[PDB]
Design an enzyme around this catalytic site. Sequence first.
Site, PDB file in Angstrom:
ATOM      1  CD  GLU A  83     -14.692  -4.116   5.241  1.00 54.15           C
ATOM      2  OE1 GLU A  83     -13.667  -3.400   5.382  1.00 54.15           O
ATOM      3  OE2 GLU A  83     -15.097  -4.492   4.107  1.00 54.15           O
ATOM      4  N   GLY A 125      -7.681   6.159   3.218  1.00 48.87           N
ATOM      5  CA  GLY A 125      -8.073   7.036   4.320  1.00 48.87           C
ATOM      6  C   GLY A 125      -8.097   8.520   4.000  1.00 48.87           C
ATOM      7  CG  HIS A 142     -10.238  -2.299   4.842  1.00 48.62           C
ATOM      8  ND1 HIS A 142     -11.527  -1.896   4.558  1.00 48.62           N
ATOM      9  CD2 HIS A 142      -9.432  -1.274   4.478  1.00 48.62           C
ATOM     10  CE1 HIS A 142     -11.500  -0.683   4.036  1.00 48.62           C
ATOM     11  NE2 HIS A 142     -10.240  -0.284   3.970  1.00 48.62           N
ATOM     12  CE1 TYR A 192      -4.532  -1.240   7.579  1.00 49.38           C
ATOM     13  CE2 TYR A 192      -3.565  -3.150   6.468  1.00 49.38           C
ATOM     14  CZ  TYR A 192      -3.566  -1.788   6.729  1.00 49.38           C
ATOM     15  OH  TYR A 192      -2.609  -0.987   6.126  1.00 49.38           O
ATOM     16  CE1 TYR A 211      -5.857  -0.378  -5.193  1.00 52.98           C
ATOM     17  CE2 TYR A 211      -4.580   1.660  -5.308  1.00 52.98           C
ATOM     18  CZ  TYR A 211      -5.342   0.761  -4.590  1.00 52.98           C
ATOM     19  OH  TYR A 211      -5.587   0.996  -3.269  1.00 52.98           O
ATOM     20  CD1 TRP A 252      -2.416  -8.472   5.681  1.00 51.10           C
ATOM     21  CD2 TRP A 252      -1.717  -7.748   7.680  1.00 51.10           C
ATOM     22  NE1 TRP A 252      -2.048  -7.154   5.543  1.00 51.10           N
ATOM     23  CE2 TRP A 252      -1.617  -6.684   6.755  1.00 51.10           C
ATOM     24  CE3 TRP A 252      -1.317  -7.533   8.998  1.00 51.10           C
ATOM     25  CZ2 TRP A 252      -1.151  -5.415   7.116  1.00 51.10           C
ATOM     26  CZ3 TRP A 252      -0.854  -6.264   9.361  1.00 51.10           C
ATOM     27  CH2 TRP A 252      -0.783  -5.225   8.423  1.00 51.10           C
ATOM     28  CD  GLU A 279     -10.534  -0.843  -0.214  1.00 48.82           C
ATOM     29  OE1 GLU A 279      -9.734   0.113  -0.387  1.00 48.82           O
ATOM     30  OE2 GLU A 279     -10.570  -1.507   0.841  1.00 48.82           O
ATOM     31  CB  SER A 280     -11.173   1.938   1.785  1.00 47.86           C
ATOM     32  OG  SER A 280     -10.798   2.472   3.055  1.00 47.86           O
ATOM     33  CD1 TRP A 317      -1.632  -2.159   2.325  1.00 49.33           C
ATOM     34  CD2 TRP A 317      -2.773  -1.667   0.450  1.00 49.33           C
ATOM     35  NE1 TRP A 317      -2.526  -3.183   2.093  1.00 49.33           N
ATOM     36  CE2 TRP A 317      -3.241  -2.904   0.953  1.00 49.33           C
ATOM     37  CE3 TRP A 317      -3.352  -1.148  -0.715  1.00 49.33           C
ATOM     38  CZ2 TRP A 317      -4.253  -3.634   0.321  1.00 49.33           C
ATOM     39  CZ3 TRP A 317      -4.354  -1.877  -1.348  1.00 49.33           C
ATOM     40  CH2 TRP A 317      -4.797  -3.105  -0.826  1.00 49.33           C
TER      41      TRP A 317
HETATM   42  P1  LIG Z   1      -9.447   2.973   3.776  1.00 47.19           P
HETATM   43  C1  LIG Z   1     -11.082   2.926   4.644  1.00 47.19           C
HETATM   44  O1  LIG Z   1      -9.390   4.053   2.764  1.00 47.19           O
HETATM   45  O2  LIG Z   1      -8.657   1.553   3.459  1.00 47.19           O
HETATM   46  C2  LIG Z   1      -7.251   1.622   3.035  1.00 47.19           C
HETATM   47  C3  LIG Z   1      -6.376   1.459   4.100  1.00 47.19           C
HETATM   48  C4  LIG Z   1      -4.879   1.190   3.392  1.00 47.19           C
HETATM   49  C5  LIG Z   1      -5.127   0.391   2.299  1.00 47.19           C
HETATM   50  C6  LIG Z   1      -6.679   0.572   1.922  1.00 47.19           C
HETATM   51  C7  LIG Z   1      -6.731   1.142   0.513  1.00 47.19           C
HETATM   52  C8  LIG Z   1      -7.350  -0.804   1.904  1.00 47.19           C
END
Ligand SMILES: *[P@@](C)(=O)O[C@H]1CCCC1(C)C
Lengths: 538, 534
Positions: free
Chosen positions: B328, B119, B441, B331, B130, B433, B199-200, B83
């Site tokens: 969810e 976030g 998530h 993590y 992606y 994990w 997503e998220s 990420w």
């Molecule tokens: P969020 C609710 O935007 O989730 C992110 C946390 C770091 C990786 C993601 C994209 C799954």
Amino acid sequence: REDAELLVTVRGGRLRGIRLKTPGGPVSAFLGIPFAEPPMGPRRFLPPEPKQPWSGVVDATTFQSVCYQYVDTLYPGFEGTEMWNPNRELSEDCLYLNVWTPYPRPTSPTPVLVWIYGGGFYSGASSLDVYDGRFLVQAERTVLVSMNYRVGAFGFLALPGSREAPGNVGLLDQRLALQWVQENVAAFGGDPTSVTLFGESAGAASVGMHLLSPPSRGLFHRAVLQSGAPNGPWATVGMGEARRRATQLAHLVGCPPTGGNDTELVACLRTRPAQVLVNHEWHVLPQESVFRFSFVPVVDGDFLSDTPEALINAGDFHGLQVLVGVVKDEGSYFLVYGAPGFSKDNESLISRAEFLAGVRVGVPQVSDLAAEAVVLHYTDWLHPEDPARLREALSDVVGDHNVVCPVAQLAGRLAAQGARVYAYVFEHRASTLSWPLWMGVPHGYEIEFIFGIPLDPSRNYTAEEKIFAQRLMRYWANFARTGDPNEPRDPKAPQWPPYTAGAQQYVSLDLRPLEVRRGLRAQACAFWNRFLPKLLSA
Amino acid sequence: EDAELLVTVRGGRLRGIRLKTPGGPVSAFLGIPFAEPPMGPRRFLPPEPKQPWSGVVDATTFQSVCYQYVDTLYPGFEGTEMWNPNRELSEDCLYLNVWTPYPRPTSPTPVLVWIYGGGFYSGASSLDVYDGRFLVQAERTVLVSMNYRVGAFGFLALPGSREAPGNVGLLDQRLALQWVQENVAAFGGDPTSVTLFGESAGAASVGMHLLSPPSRGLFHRAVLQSGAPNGPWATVGMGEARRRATQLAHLVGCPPGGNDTELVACLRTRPAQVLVNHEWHVLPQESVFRFSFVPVVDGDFLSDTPEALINAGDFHGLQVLVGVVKDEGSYFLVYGAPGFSKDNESLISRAEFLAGVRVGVPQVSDLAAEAVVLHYTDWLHPEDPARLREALSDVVGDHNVVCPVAQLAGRLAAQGARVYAYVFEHRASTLSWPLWMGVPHGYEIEFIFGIPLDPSRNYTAEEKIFAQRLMRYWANFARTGDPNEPRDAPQWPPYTAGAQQYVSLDLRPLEVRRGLRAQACAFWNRFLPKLLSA
Ligand SMILES: *[P@@](C)(=O)O[C@H]1CCCC1(C)C
Ligand SMILES: *[C@@H]1O[C@H](CO)[C@@H](O)[C@H](O)[C@H]1NC(C)=O
Ligand SMILES: C[P@@H](=O)O[C@H]1CCCC1(C)C
């Protein structure tokens, strides 16, 4: 001439009893023993005075009058309601108790069971057929005592602080009877050092209040609380709400010519016919409800120095054994007394809208937020509108809030603070039950099995119910004798383990052998006992 | 010379690159500028359209990642590193990417537009997970993804001020969506068939474009994966946004006084990395699943709270696909819940569970916290560590994702939209994990993008077939508003507020179930707002 077994001398004077036939053999009954001066006229609302001694022989040969009380007319002639209605004339001259003993009289001191009837503190009588002590005494050879105590305004109208209507005099009636048992039960062969109180619903709450009031606590050794607890939301009232109800009742019957001098207001109330007070009793309640009763014990710092929950939480209960339990469907009976959509005469498959309205009837006098919290916990959000599930959930609301969760809280706190506790759920629906099938095992329908009524030959219980009744009577007397319902020396029967706040074990009582289970509706009762009080403070 | 990789858009000419997949080539145009670089005096301001260029823009490699915090909790661990930024950080980051079939379509092709999560403080369109090459090859769509500003650069707000109005990262996304309308046809894409998926925080972003009228004309359907604009984390009120902006100024040595102009001017003189270094410290308390600079409800991009806009909306004619992963909350627990670590079983105690409830449900009254503990305690086993671990995972996941998504789905369905819902229940054979985290998530994304088809990865044969199934559902939905294939399947039924039907997605055939954690979400969505307001 005379039968010496039917003659007894108590401190007040001499008594003559009767010899009762039972399926298993004769029993001696002394029915209608006066234990207080009649609380008539100037003595209405006052604490009981002990009966003055008498010369000659009092015939204690039939049940005395039922204390003045409202009479249920919801289903006239229906067996399910009439069995609880008075079966003697109503009178304010009602402070009499009953003693059953084996025939011949016990040679050595015998443990005593003392029954306290329920009826929501507004009704009841020791003379009801379902409280017939002859079978218990014959089957298990204890002594059984039951007393009448004032109910309704006569027993529990309170103008707190006043000398003329201090409140709680019905509980003082019960205490005087227990003092009578201490001073006199040996004359019948009973052991004053082994007295077990037992009671159901308001009688169970009374038993608990005697646990929590030190002057009563010296008068017994064990306690059995069936389907009631002193901490229930219906079983006590605060000083201000008691004064409000007393004052509105006086106002509704012309007293005074609305408050004023307490002395003058009570004096005016004493001039009213008993039936006049009874006719207005239900009108002093603050809202439409079920499982709420106008005149109940008042928390005034005297009989109860604090609320029953506070006394339960702060109490040291080492050296006490209690047996507590509930029936399977505590809440069902009460719904036909005001919950919209409910009748004993149909299936009561209510709508969601009727469920929401019923929540406010079954949980009266709480905030909208509190009501929403109830709706959240008792709704199945995968089936929020299913009529059968809503009917079951409203029954659970009323039964959990008024009986199961108060019993569970008392059971858990007493166990944690030193008491040996045994808990049950009564799950047998009597073959003779007249209420509809959807009510399940209703509140109050274990009593007849505890008293051995199925052994009555004129009744039509099945044979295994007679076996069941014999087993329950045997569970109740072992606890009376030993503080332990388990049969003194065996590893044949599956055994009844104590209830503890952690494992929360209880047994199911029905036609099958004992089955151990966990949790007295633990998820629900965490809402009523732990969370909801925090919400009402905040 | 390859004419397939030469495109003229409105701003000028582009040179793309041919990419290989196991199913054949695709054309990719990576790093296309869609805005003027928001540098210097343009920091915190709405994006400006890219001015035309002469010559040929080199669009063969991903461009820079927008400045953001880099996770250092588990250095070198794949589960966090996948990420983190995989290109250099820069404020010059407003670029977007187009993948098309090879040779380029000569017939209008439906468009998928990906908005990454993170976030609102992190994320990049260049992340391996992606990679849009497999979806485009297998399902013959055009796929667009853009970079948008995150953290303070995208969402610092001094409400009312013209110098830092807030929500400019959302305007970066809208500008890229306008770019798609004007230019996607030059790649073969059909601007009349644009499906947003994210997503998220990307799903929260999709939802906000649904509820903002100037964005609604820029797309036609929406996919919301594990996020919703009504999340307790996805928006912030004006007062708290202003408080957070002013504490960042103080922490980096800026005024107030006081005056917004001087405050922003001083912030503009600070290296980007300095703002990043103090980002986490403007939060009001210890927490998980809370982020400092998020979209602000100020009446402009959002004329009301997303909750209000969702309840007041006429959603006839909308099709949405929404869903969640099976676990969810798991993590997030290792980022602040007492007793949790990815390196042990995280078998917490009751005392840690109760402390964890204030971390995972921050900024609520003690009474609110007590009601959470009531609902999520098993009072027959109040102290069992494994059940407490699971329960606090449920608290964090329900509060932040599952119940906001369930609320969005129910209200949209009841107000005219056709909704499809899923729960993703497959744990990747490759997942790094620990097993107690279940299906965490973010770990459905690699399957939606067909990453398992990459032969240099270690996915199983059944997992590749599963990725192909999911790519077909997503593209079916983009093409028709209905994920279902022709009846053989079983069929995937629409979600409704009453029946509440959704499907499970895993290696087995679709199985229809009822209720997105209905009992828990009645607490969060129905009861708890009444309690907080009284
Ligand atoms: P969020 C609710 O935007 O989730 C992110 C946390 C770091 C990786 C993601 C994209 C799954
Ligand atoms: C009214 O009450 C007082 C005490 O409160 C009492 O002494 C007085 O006698 C009462 N009135 C009459 C007429 O007796
Ligand atoms: C709760 P309690 O007062 O309930 C009473 C009502 C009539 C029968 C009964 C069960 C003895």
